[PDB]
Amino acid sequence: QISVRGLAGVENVTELKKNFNRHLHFTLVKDRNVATPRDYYFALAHTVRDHLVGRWIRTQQHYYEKDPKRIYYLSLEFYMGRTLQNTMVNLALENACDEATYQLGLDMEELEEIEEDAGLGNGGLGRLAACFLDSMATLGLAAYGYGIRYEFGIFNQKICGGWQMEEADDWLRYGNPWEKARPEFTLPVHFYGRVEHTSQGAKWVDTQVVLAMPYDTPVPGYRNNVVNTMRLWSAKAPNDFNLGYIQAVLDRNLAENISRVLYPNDNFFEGKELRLKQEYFVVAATLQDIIRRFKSSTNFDAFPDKVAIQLNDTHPSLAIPELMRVLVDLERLDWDKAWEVTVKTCAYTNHTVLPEALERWPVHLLETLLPRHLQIIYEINQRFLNRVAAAFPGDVDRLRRMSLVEEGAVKRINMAHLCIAGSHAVNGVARIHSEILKKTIFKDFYELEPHKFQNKTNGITPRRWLVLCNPGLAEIIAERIGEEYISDLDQLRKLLSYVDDEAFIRDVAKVKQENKLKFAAYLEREYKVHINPNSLFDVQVKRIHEYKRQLLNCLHVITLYNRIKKEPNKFVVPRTVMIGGKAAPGYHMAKMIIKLITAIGDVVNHDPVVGDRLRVIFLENYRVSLAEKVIPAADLSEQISTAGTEASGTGNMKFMLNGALTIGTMDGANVEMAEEAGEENFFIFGMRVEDVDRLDQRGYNAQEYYDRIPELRQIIEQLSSGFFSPKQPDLFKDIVNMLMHHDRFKVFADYEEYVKCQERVSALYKNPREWTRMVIRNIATSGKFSSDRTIAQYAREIWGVEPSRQRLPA
Amino acid sequence: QISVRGLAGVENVTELKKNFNRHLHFTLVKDRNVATPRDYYFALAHTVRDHLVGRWIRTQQHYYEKDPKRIYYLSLEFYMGRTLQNTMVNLALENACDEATYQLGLDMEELEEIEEDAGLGNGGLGRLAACFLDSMATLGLAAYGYGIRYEFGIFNQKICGGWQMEEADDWLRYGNPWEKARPEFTLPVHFYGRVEHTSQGAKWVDTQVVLAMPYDTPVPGYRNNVVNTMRLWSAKAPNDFNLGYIQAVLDRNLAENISRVLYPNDNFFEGKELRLKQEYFVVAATLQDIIRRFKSSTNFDAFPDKVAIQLNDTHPSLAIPELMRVLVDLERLDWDKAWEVTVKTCAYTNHTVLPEALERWPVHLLETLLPRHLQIIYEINQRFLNRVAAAFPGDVDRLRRMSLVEEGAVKRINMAHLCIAGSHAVNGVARIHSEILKKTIFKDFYELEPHKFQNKTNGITPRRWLVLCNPGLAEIIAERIGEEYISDLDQLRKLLSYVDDEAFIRDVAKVKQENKLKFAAYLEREYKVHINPNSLFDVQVKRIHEYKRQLLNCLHVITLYNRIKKEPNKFVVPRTVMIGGKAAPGYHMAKMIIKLITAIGDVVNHDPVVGDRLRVIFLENYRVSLAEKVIPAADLSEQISTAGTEASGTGNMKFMLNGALTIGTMDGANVEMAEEAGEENFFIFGMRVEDVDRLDQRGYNAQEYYDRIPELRQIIEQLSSGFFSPKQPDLFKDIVNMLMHHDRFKVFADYEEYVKCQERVSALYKNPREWTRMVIRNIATSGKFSSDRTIAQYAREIWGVEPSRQRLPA
Ligand SMILES: O=c1ccn([C@@H]2O[C@H](CO)[C@@H](O)[C@H](F)[C@H]2O)c(=O)[nH]1
Ligand SMILES: O=c1ccn([C@@H]2O[C@H](CO)[C@@H](O)[C@H](F)[C@H]2O)c(=O)[nH]1
């Protein structure tokens, strides 16, 4: 049907239909008489999977023969979403499968909706890992993603009476056709026990053993016949475990709980024992696998030449002392040699500066669970602080600030400090964030070892986030500039030549309208909610957090409503305001924000005076599959974090690629996006980082803003008095109190500039042609934000390997 | 190679090799370079499974079209063993697969050893269910086995320092290629809650819900293209379950524990809540499935015309009040009508008369877990006792004896009484057992409803228990009489014509010697134990229990040892005495018996004066796969239960079919075996049932035997003094005390006759030709003991259906 979706050759279509029928019969044990749409999905998935196999086996054989340096990406989160369409895209099978299924009397898009998301992450950090795997395969790197196979991923969110409710994400219920269990490569992991000192070094004895069983999932590169591996570990009890009899068998659950469920916190540290077990479990199993693979290719001097380990945040930070443990206790290397190897092998990526997100583990937990690792951490600390003392003699404050051990009521280990000490490279995820690291939280470390500190601006994969989710836009672009941009996104710059092309202007606007119609129809079908497709689609989708300021958005919505009520007969640009995202189950304020949003909708959506000029919708169960639907439909992207709080953002990049304009602060990657597109082509407002610092120095007083801004005063009075909660007048008292007395994120301080900037947005939207021309200027300059660019920089500047766009033989 | 294993045609072999290679590549994602024997097993299993599929789909379609009466066999145990060879046998693929694998450079018998047993049973009762499924498919009945998919089957037994140790049977670790998950047919099961009475009947409300997810396994008939289904339920929590957050997800284990593990008790009732939950879980899910299937073919008058439910023991007895609950509470039938349907639908098989094995559930457990079922049971009891009172007016003792409710310290429900009241047929499992039921424990019920009581003598499948485990014997038989006997075992009578045939005598003896050599080699390979293949193989394999009298066997072994030590230079027929079987983890005496056996071996096997004239071996981890190895190798089958205690036995039948002679009491099916073969061709000894009754009446005094039998006195003195436990002289004091003062099973009373009978065995073994002629007389008359005969009798006399040996189209 469309060119970027590949060829539908007679031979291929015939073969696909044959194998589809085979799987339905032999694999699913069904006939066409009793088969349901779910059976048809599975027959298609197995058919497409077959095409991955040959390439998967030969890629891994190729790495064995060539023995390139291997890259290991360690993460507690891989937010993968659905796999079927992505696999077809990367193998050039989309049109062929579409034709084959059509001839069998089936609608492929209907079958695609049956697949469960692999929701093994919380938000940005987990989704970055997923984009990275796609880019590493596309650039021909010998890369492996290592994580945990959670039985339950991020919870399914239901909205009941306007409140968030959580349901278990039982994503494996119907099976996972993509994974291959590898019980033969099961490895032991040790917990608890005690340290024994012998004539020849320390010994970790009397441990409890949990087995780590790997499941491998293929990761296809874009049309290069490369298929890499994501290996996820699942926890299993040993067979003599606890071995009255019945209870001992039932108690196997205790061991197997390690891989049961993803902790649903985003940008918030919860110091629970089970989470620490998960972190060690992934690190211990992965490192054994790494060392095994290295030996099968005596002398650890070459270890950093053949192995790179990337730590995604501090979650897998135990890799550092675990590597030391293995090299010193088991392989019998001297300390200094082991440390040299460890530092040259490991690198660390930081994703946030918010103090509450930083992992600081109580010493007493580490002492009980991982006694040998605590000893190693103490020794690392002693040697590191001896270097600091030598470099900055007499600076006793610096010694306390830089220590891995934090003194106080309870002693803690600062895992970020451990990561910096034991890594040869430390990076932030956008230029402003990397600069903040050097100037503030890691200033002391930067002064000691400046060479360690780097920037690697985040990116997103243009396969999932353009070709897959927005084929209409991909097609009109390919018509003008060909197909090479899909693996070389910088080529989108060629589109600047079409900014005054009346045909292209019309096509860009047509694609957006079709996307909006499709999404408007999706909402009525699946959720019974009515929206006007001619309105400006104003969208903020991301996890619910105070720093992201969904609350500032709420204030603007109420402002719009109040202005309409004051002058009902004045024209206003119609808007559909959509907000979605999950709140961590224990985060009270975030749960209250969700309730506020639905409560505003309850009033606004039913006021006959408003009509269809303003609608407020809460998008339930935001996740990767939903992002693929709403992003291509958006006109306006809300990226409104307080300056200095969002390290990069990646949702911002997805919206830019898909033809939405951005309203945002100069925060994270917003700064670089505006720089690429030109500030005239962005809607920038509010305090810069320096302005926030100035306000902190004299002290933030929210009352000042309330006193001087009459429109703001009205909203707070409405919230306090019960206007949005008639039956429970004091429902939002917590929100008002926080805004007025305890607001770390200065919502009121950016209110006036935000509202004025939103007026400028509405003004441009009244002029379709000039709106679309600005859109073209954004799409055309989005190239820097491909994760292919990001990964090429990691490869060259951290891992010491060269990317390759060359095909493996088919 | 051998004829009964079918054809190895060029087309078939080529096709099998092709599909083997396909599965290795696409299914297992391996290449020949890295594949292990386990990978090769799985490639073969998937290849053979493919051949089942077409027949499986078309059999089930055939039942849908023809709508025959359906038979539902409800059991908490299905002791299936391995599936690969059985499937090849029934599909006539054995020789073809052997050739195909040989051409690929693989040994098929080596691959067969990799498969785990499906050990979803304890012993006789569970294995009977397995033989029954095979026979029902072979006789073309529309039959379904329904049970529980235990994650852990019967424990693996290890012997450490002579003691039994238990290890979890993690049989699903590497996957199960035979099953197909059917998550789409998941059904809810209710627990706890309370009963509400409305204007229109009772309502069971406020329940906890557990989901039952089915897994289907194919059951092939012998070369008739019939493939029936065994459906096993697995427990799953609902997704809103317990839905702080992390704990609620982890607590899903509580619901899912229902299907976690098989209770390892054999002939012993343990009244634990989790076991009651398992019993209701299987009954509730199964009955919904039954009713669904019935409606898809309003009026329940025809229900018993289209449905038969067979209760394997009282374990699924809750089917009776559950059927009543559904018919009365949900379908709104009047009580009397519902009861008529229930009685005509249900039938009950009793497997033991031992009082400690009878299920008597505390009322307080049923009251909390199943409040509506308790109410229904009370109502059944009231109506039943009104019938008794009308038939036997004034007989107040009879009313207390027959009540379903047992009065006392704790009130209990007698599940056997419930089963008799609510079934149209009640059967014992051998003629003597069925007679004992009518004369003793169920006498009152027999007097009220004589027509209900039947006999169905047990049997074994000649596919698994001859063709599969003893192809050598199957072949020499087929050479003389053809292949028809495999599905018509009565044809073995034709072999009486060859009792004086010198060629056949030589061949029968040759097959036994080869079997003995193979097993002798197995023991050295897998267990490093040396045995003399020329010795008489004297075998007792079955679960360890006081009633089965492994202890009597022990007394004979010590007698033999003491006689040798007294006259070292006298000739004795050399014996290898092998005893194997598992003890329930909480059964102290059974565990002590295992220790005694190993302790005897420790002395006997290392006495240089004995030489290789006597060896005592404990066969570790007795299970179906081991039975298939040891039974064809046996010369002497020990079936020595106290008369009136072993309801039938089925191990006895397996030995008779495979060319062992039997030493046994007149107990269970031993009586019918001796009758078929002729008493001259059996080694019968000991008290009959009547003799046991006489001894009970005057009182059993073990001291009398000790006083009058000098050889018995010596053994007890040896046991007491520490002869078999030098380091722990009082180790066996419990055993001695029981034998002397508290022996319910009268071990001493049969000792003298047993020893004398064993002398007669040794005498015959000295004459190879006459030994073998007696063997031929046993094999030739084993036909009655085919489970095909048993199932034909159930079909005609209980279920009201006609068996069919006719092929379905291929
Ligand atoms: O706990 C966290 C901490 C940070 N992050 C995010 O990581 C993304 C990937 O670098 C960045 O784009 C965002 F700026 C950052 O908030 C999370 O998503 N969970
Ligand atoms: O709990 C029990 C009770 C009885 N049984 C057995 O059932 C077999 C099948 O009918 C019979 O051959 C045996 F006689 C009987 O002991 C068991 O194996 N477990």
Per the structure block, which two tokens stand in for A192? 């608890």
Residues of chain A immediately before an interruption (C to N > 2.5 Å): 243, 297
Identify the three-state secondary structure at position A196.
strand
Strands A118-120 and A208-220: unpaired
What distance in Å separates the CA atoms of residue A444 and residue B86, rounded to the nearest whole number? 72
The residues facing A212 across adjacent strands are: A187, A235
CB B474 within 8 A of CB B782: no
B582 and B640 inside one domain: yes
Is B293 annotated for ligand binding? yes
What distance in Å separates the CA atoms of residue B485 and residue B487, rounded to the nearest whole number? 5
A582 lines ligand 1 (CB under 6 A): no
Rounded (10°) CA dihedral A101, A106, A109, A110? -150
What distance in Å separates the CA atoms of residue B730 and residue A132, rounded to the nearest whole number? 70
The residue to which tokens 């997810």 are assigned? B213
The stretches of B440-534 forming alpha helices (DSSP H) are: 443-448, 471-481, 502-527
Interface membership of B29 toward A (CB under 8 Å): yes
Q: Active site includes A433? A: no
A727 and A796 inside one domain: no
| A29: chain B residues, CB-CB within 8 Å | 53, 56-57, 180
**Nearest ligand, measured from the Cα of A126:** 1
CB A635 within 8 A of CB A538: yes
Per the structure block, which two tokens stand in for B40? 């090769």
Amino acid present at A639: Q
CA distances from B439 to B338, B443, B669, B678, B691 (A): 31, 5, 18, 27, 16
Interface membership of B257 toward A (CB under 8 Å): yes
Rounded (10°) CA dihedral A450, A312, A422, A148? 180
Q: Active site includes A766? A: no
CB B573 within 8 A of CB B618: no
Q: Which of B548, B556, B613, B623 is catalytic?
A: B548
A127 and A188 inside one domain: yes
| A24: chain B residues, CB-CB within 8 Å | none
**Nearest ligand, measured from the Cα of A652:** 1
For B183, the closest chain A residue by CA position comes to A174
Give every CB contact of residue A561 below 8 A, 6+ residues apart in sequence: A600, A603, A604, A607, A610, A614
What are the phi and psi torsion angles at B355 (to 5°)? Answer: -55, -35
Per the structure block, which two tokens stand in for B13? 């072999």
CB A503 within 8 A of CB A497: no
CB A613 within 8 A of CB A567: no
| A257: chain B residues, CB-CB within 8 Å | 250
Q: Which of A149, A412, A456, A542 is catalytic?
A: A542
Interface membership of B64 toward A (CB under 8 Å): no
A458 lines ligand 1 (CB under 6 A): yes
A266 lines ligand 1 (CB under 6 A): yes
For residue A383, count other CB atoms closer than 10 A to its CB.
Answer: 13
B157 and B43 inside one domain: yes
For residue B22, the surrounding DSSP H or E stretch is helix B10-22
Beta-carbon separation of B183 and A168 below 8 A: no
The residues facing B214 across adjacent strands are: B233
Is B98 annotated for ligand binding? no
Which domain, by its residues, includes A558?
460-786
Interface membership of A245 toward B (CB under 8 Å): yes
Handedness of CA B173, B175, B178, B180 (dihedral sign): positive
What are the phi and psi torsion angles at B589 (to 5°)? Answer: -60, -40
CB B171 within 8 A of CB B117: yes
Give the ligand 2 atom nearest the CA of B668.
14
- CB neighbour burial string for B503-528, b if at least 16 within 10 angstroms, e if fewer: ebbebbbebbeebbeebbeebeeeee
Of the partner residues B29, B165, B261, the one whose CB lies closest to the CB of residue A246: B261
B762 and B803 inside one domain: no
Beta-carbon separation of B31 and A57 below 8 A: yes
CB B429 within 8 A of CB B352: no
**Closest alpha carbon to A546 in A314, A275, A357, A758:** A357
CB A780 within 8 A of CB A493: yes
DSSP state of A407: P
Per the structure block, which two tokens stand in for A136? 């590493």
What distance in Å separates the CA atoms of residue B641 and residue A745, rounded to the nearest whole number? 83
CA angle B687, B689, B691 (to 5 degrees): 50
The residue to which tokens 């620490």 are assigned? A276
CB B230 within 8 A of CB B120: no
| A34: chain B residues, CB-CB within 8 Å | none
Expressed in angstroms and rounded, the spacing between residue B160 Cα and the centre of ligand 2 is 28
Interface membership of A241 toward B (CB under 8 Å): yes
What distance in Å separates the CA atoms of residue B627 and residue B457, rounded to the nearest whole number? 22
Q: Active site includes B46? A: no
Number of domains in chain A: 2
Strands B208-220 and B227-236: antiparallel
B193 lines ligand 2 (CB under 6 A): no
A796 and A737 inside one domain: no
Identify the three-state secondary structure at position A612.
coil
- SS3 of B398-448: HHHHHCCEECCCCCEEEHHHHHHHCCCEEEECCHHHHHHHHHCCCHHHHHH
Residues, chain A: 810
Per-position DSSP letters for A459-528, written without gaps between them: -B-TIIIIIIT-HHHHHHHHHHH-SGGGG-GGGGGGGGGGTT-HHHHHHHHHHHHHHHHHHHHHHHHHH-
The stretches of A299-442 forming alpha helices (DSSP H) are: 303-306, 319-325, 335-345, 363-369, 371-391, 396-402, 415-421, 431-439
Report resolution (Å) to 1 decimal. 1.9
DSSP state of A233: E
Beta-carbon separation of B246 and A173 below 8 A: no
Question: What is the interface size between A and B, counted as CB pairs within 8 Å?
Answer: 103
CA distances from A666 to A123, A693, A761, B136 (A): 21, 14, 17, 76
Interface membership of B57 toward A (CB under 8 Å): yes
Beta-carbon separation of B245 and A173 below 8 A: no
B621 and B665 inside one domain: yes
The residue to which tokens 């202007």 are assigned? A505
Expressed in angstroms and rounded, the spacing between residue A312 Cα and the centre of ligand 1 is 10
**C-alpha R_g of chain A:** 27
A237 and A207 inside one domain: yes
Q: Which of A149, A360, A548, A595 is catalytic?
A: A548
The residue to which tokens 């109190």 are assigned? A737
A128 lines ligand 1 (CB under 6 A): yes
| A25: chain B residues, CB-CB within 8 Å | 53-54, 57
B682 and B628 inside one domain: yes
Give the ligand 1 atom nearest the CA of A124.
18
What are the phi and psi torsion angles at B188 (to 5°)? Answer: -85, 145
Closest residue to atom 12 of ligand 2, CA basis: B649
Amino acid present at B159: I
Expressed in angstroms and rounded, the spacing between residue B615 Cα and the centre of ligand 2 is 30
Is A332 annotated for ligand binding? no
Beta-carbon separation of A239 and B168 below 8 A: yes
| B181: chain A residues, CB-CB within 8 Å | 175
Per the structure block, which two tokens stand in for B11? 């087309």
CB B67 within 8 A of CB B297: yes
A352 lines ligand 1 (CB under 6 A): yes
Q: Active site includes B186? A: no
- Domain containing A419 — which CATH number? 3.40.50.2000
Give the ligand 1 atom nearest the CA of A648.
14
Of the partner residues A26, A57, A243, the one whose CB lies closest to the CB of residue B50: A26
Residue window 95-154, chain A: list those with CB within 8 Å of chain B: 152
A326 and A469 inside one domain: no
Experimental technique behind these coordinates = X-ray
Half-sphere exposure in the Cβ direction for A510 (13 Å, CA): 10
CB A695 within 8 A of CB A679: no
The residues facing A78 across adjacent strands are: A120
Beta-carbon separation of B25 and A257 below 8 A: no
Give every CB contact of residue A261 below 8 A, 6+ residues apart in sequence: A150, A151, A152, B246, B249, B250
Closest residue to atom 4 of ligand 1, CA basis: A351
- SS3 of B137-175: HHCCCCEEEEEECCCECCCEEEEECCEEEEECCCCCCCC
Is B411 annotated for ligand binding? no
Is B295 annotated for ligand binding? yes
CB B663 within 8 A of CB B577: no
Give every CB contact of residue B662 below 8 A, 6+ residues apart in sequence: B636, B637, B639, B652, B655, B656, B670, B673, B682, B683, B778
B723 and B755 inside one domain: yes
**Nearest ligand, measured from the Cα of B456:** 2
A125 lines ligand 1 (CB under 6 A): yes
What distance in Å separates the CA atoms of residue B18 and residue B16, rounded to the nearest whole number? 5
A257 and A380 inside one domain: yes
Q: Active site includes B252? A: no
For A171, the closest chain B residue by CA position comes to B239
